[PDB]
């Protein structure tokens, strides 16, 4: 006979709720657990794995294995551009299908550093130098090497070690950024420029390729879970 009083919000079906519920099958002997390798306890353990980036997504190249290759050849000049893309992991077409991008497209906010691992896939005698650059916003994109040199740049020398890491830091005004496009939280621009040249000996190919992997740093975070705009169904599959 305890007198109570119901408050606004009773007898409702909230989606993201956490209450208790009577079980339909009482006294069920659950099958015991076993040790299965590779247990995941947090989704940021998947975001910290390198994911191949399709930088060359131009026209038909997306329908073959040529989307993941970045062309680099022996040029007659110096200071030209190899590639460039905006820092939009959850929006740009370059980072949309990467593991990092697939994870980010479920959460509205994101923050932390980024790690771009470049691997040179040329011959054993071909040598070269490249200038990777990250330029925060404020101006447009850099158009010449004298303009991207002033950003955050790391010269890379092709040698025995065939892997170089570009750590795009966290330079922003807000603690978090949106995965969707918004000019208020613009990211920046990542551009790679020929440093000197790509020189090869005789009887060796002068056109090589470079691959790129994207991964998150130890300080990545995500927030505000939302539905992904990639998967859709016209009717219940059957």
């Amino acid at each position: 006979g305890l007198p109570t009083m119901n408050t606004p919000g009773s007898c409702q079906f909230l989606t993201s709720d956490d209450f208790q519920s009577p079980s339909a099958m009482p006294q069920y002997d659950v099958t015991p657990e076993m040790k299965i390798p590779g247990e995941v306890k947090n989704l940021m353990e998947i975001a910290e794995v390198d994911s191949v980036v399709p930088v060359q997504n131009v026209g038909e190249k997306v329908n073959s294995m040529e989307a993941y290759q970045i062309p680099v050849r022996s040029n007659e000049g110096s200071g030209t551009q190899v590639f460039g893309f905006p820092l939009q992991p959850g929006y740009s077409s370059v980072f949309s299908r990467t593991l990092l991008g697939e994870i980010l497209n479920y959460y509205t906010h994101w923050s932390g550093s980024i790690k771009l691992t470049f691997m040179f896939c040329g011959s054993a005698m071909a040598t070269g130098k490249f200038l990777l650059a990250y330029s925060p916003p404020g101006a447009g994109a850099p158009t010449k090497r004298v303009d991207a040199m002033l950003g955050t740049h790391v010269v890379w020398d092709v040698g025995l070690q065939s892997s170089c890491v570009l750590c795009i830091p966290w330079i922003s005004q807000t603690h978090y950024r949106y995965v969707a496009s918004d000019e208020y939280t613009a990211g920046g621009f990542i551009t790679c420029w020929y440093q000197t040249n790509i020189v090869v000996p005789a009887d060796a190919q002068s056109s090589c390729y470079i691959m790129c992997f994207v991964s998150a740093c130890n300080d990545f975070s995500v927030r505000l879970l939302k539905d992904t705009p990639f998967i859709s169904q016209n009717s219940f599959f059957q």
Binding site: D18, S21, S23
Partner: protein
């Protein structure tokens, strides 16, 4: 027999929880298990590779 635990609040307050059903599969979802171990997927190699070292000497 109540269980008192801490609430998830901002940075820079205790809440109470009591189990009523005797099936152990009716408890509320355990949301606070912030434990990780990224050593299985990243850096899974057999021989340890220090950061600032020629990976292939």
């Amino acid at each position: 027999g109540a269980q008192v635990s801490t609430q998830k609040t901002g940075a820079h307050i205790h809440y109470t929880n009591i189990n009523y059903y005797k099936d152990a599969a009716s408890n509320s979802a355990t949301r606070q298990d912030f434990a990780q171990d990224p050593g299985k997927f990243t850096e899974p190699v057999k021989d340890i590779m220090i950061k600032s070292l020629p990976a292939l000497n």
